[model samples]
Target: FEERSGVVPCGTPWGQWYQTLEEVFIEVQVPPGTRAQDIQCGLQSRHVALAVGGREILKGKLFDSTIADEGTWTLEDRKMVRIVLTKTKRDAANCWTSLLESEYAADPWVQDQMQRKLTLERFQKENPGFDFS
Candidate 1:
């Protein structure tokens, strides 16, 4: 966890972070006289970036698990940008889950549906899925 905070030559720096059972909340205190429109929050599958006034101010990991595709960003009182990230997986039992889950092991119908057919045509016919807060 390479978490860091301080004042730099570009701007004053301060932040607070914590985690929940399924999410992490990051509150970054902006430099004085900054605007909400000037702040942009970029999220990746495993990372997050914060830009202030067109400058790359901070970037860090939001959590251990993969992050959901959707997230929420808001400017609160022109003082801080609040970020909310939800966990991609909520439990250990589904740790190995992927984009698709089948009940072939326990259901005969699922086995029949998947019988002798291992092509990607069906799954590739449409765009993938996404999730966010």
Candidate 2:
């Protein structure tokens, strides 16, 4: 089963289990003096939204938010987090399927409902291993 730390199989020996798939990659560079810890926290927050939003994160994958004491991530981890965030942002920003955007353009209640749907989606992400179906 996949956990927040990384993907793993439920019934396999840890020593023999290995991932062979192509990785999803994202790359970014921070300015000098930037703290990795802060960046990690930021990613964690956005990850919550992405989780709640659903339909974006790869199945069985969790956004790992554990930051180092130094408040900075290695270049590799930083890039991975950035990539996940980008995917999440796209999911949250993509709401064209909502009827309220067109059917109830002037209705505040509809707007609120739409927002709530997104929020619930994020909630679903935080509590993983759930079958929404």
Candidate 3:
């Protein structure tokens, strides 16, 4: 009962998130003219919540621990809410299965595709100086 053993689509309702070895980038589009004063973004060691103009856009329980104090958010051109979060346990050998601990899991076909990417990434590191793309 923990989370389909971990795997989900790479997007959320409001926006999507992507990551690298040490950090995660989250982007959520807001209404035009979204004022910084009315934007409420909460980042923590195991959670995140973003609100704009009193409307909750994205909220979730993070899949892993993060360095809450080392994260930052910015209003991109006053049209997008961009956030950068740093993971507490840095590991480059693997990528995250999902950003949140939602009960629903990724489709088996999608999981296979994701697994393919991870396998390629692993092989990419194993065989240096080779491009798998």
Best by TM-score: 3
Decreasing TM-score order of the candidates: 3, 1, 2
User: How far out, in Å, is residue 15 in model 2?
Assistant: 47
- Candidate 1 similarity to native, TM-score: 0.43
Q: Model 2 segments beyond 4 Å from truth?
A: 1-88, 91-106, 130-133
Rate residue 99 of model 2 by lDDT. Answer: 32
Count of steric clashes across candidates, in order = 2, 9, 0
lDDT of 3: 0.74
Query: Each candidate's TM vs. the true structure?
Result: 0.43, 0.22, 0.51
- Which stretches of model 3 miss by more than 4 angstroms? 1-9, 78-133
lDDT of 1 by residue, 1-133 (tens): 1132111122234676655456666777776777778988887777888899898877887546455676667877653567775558533223222223652132444333343232233333343463211
Full-model lDDT, candidate 1: 0.56
Which stretch of 10 consecutive residues in model 3 shows the poorest summed lDDT? 1-10
Per-residue alpha-carbon lDDT of model 3 for 1-133, expressed as tens digits? 2432333336777767777668887878777788899899999999999889998888889989999999899987743568988877544434445566774555666556677777777678779988655
Candidate 2 lDDT by residue in tens digits, 44-131: 3223211112222222323443333323324332333333233334454464343344552424554566666777787688778888
Q: Candidates' lDDT values, in order?
A: 0.56, 0.38, 0.74
